[PDB]
């Protein structure tokens, strides 16, 4: 019972976040993903939103595409010679925000 109510409330929050009146959607190109997130930063800054207390929650497909991106896989293109996007499949920070992977939201959003 407690687990069901907890998951139902998480679904409630997910529907709240996903159903918001978003004016425009920023299309992430899976071959070059960074400009989409830099564009999101540009749009939010141009609205004078404070730069603190920002959360980035990505779906499974978005995180997988970030890991697959040659910007993060190739160590010459990103520094990071340990190559955490190749040995691991983890892209953790880009465009000044930290990535939070969630299964509640849609995979490609």
């Amino acid at each position: 019972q407690v687990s069901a109510v907890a998951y139902e409330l998480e679904d409630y929050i997910a529907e709240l976040i996903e159903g918001a009146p978003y004016e425009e959607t920023i299309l992430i190109d899976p071959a070059d993903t960074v400009p989409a997130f830099i564009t999101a930063d540009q749009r939010m800054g141009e609205a004078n939103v404070p730069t603190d207390s920002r959360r980035l929650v990505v779906g499974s497909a978005v995180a997988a595409a970030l890991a697959k991106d040659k910007q993060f896989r190739h160590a010459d293109w990103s520094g990071d010679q340990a190559n955490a996007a190749l040995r691991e499949a983890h892209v953790g920070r880009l465009a000044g925000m930290n990535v939070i992977r969630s299964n509640a939201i849609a995979p490609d959003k």
Binding site: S3, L9, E10, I13, A14, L16, I17, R55, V57, A104
Partner: peptide, 11 residues
Amino acid sequence: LQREIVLPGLV
């Protein structure tokens, strides 16, 4: 198999 719950903490 059930997913982890992360959303309630971020809102």
